[model samples]
Target: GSSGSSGCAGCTNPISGLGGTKYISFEERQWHNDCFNCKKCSLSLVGRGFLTERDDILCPDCGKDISGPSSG
Candidate 1:
């Protein structure tokens, strides 16, 4: 099947991209604020913080072991 307009490239979830809501953009990909989380621990990373390692988006705590800092 083809990817739909509602399919998010980040969490692989459905998103309407509606209501003037803002989404997080990395490189060229975009994801809903709540839809975004640490792939390892599933932690909410909205206002908490996030870090991208090469191609993966993660929270500071879960990402610190592989990425850089964890200030956020």
Candidate 2:
């Protein structure tokens, strides 16, 4: 059962960044793939990269992105 792979995927981070350090939220339903700035790496810090279909949860930086999904 040891895959020697990462496990933080599909999980939510406890950080915030938009208008302030606590602008948005990273709760149980938060989107990890859409988090451009978190404790791990940097994503769509400009205006692209993070893509999406819906607009329920979009980072302020990017207008529309698919950060959260119905079920991962």
The top-ranked prediction according to TM-score is 1
lDDT of each: 0.70, 0.36
Instruction: Give each model a TM-score.
Output: 0.61, 0.19
* Residues forming the 10-long window of minimal summed lDDT in candidate 1: 1-10
lDDT comparing candidate 2 with the true structure: 0.36
lDDT of 1 at 16: 69
lDDT of 1 at 26: 59
Looking at model 1, the pairs that clash are none
At residue 68, give the lDDT of candidate 2. 43
Q: Candidate 2: where are CA atoms >4 Å away?
A: 1-11, 17-19, 22-34, 37-46, 54-72
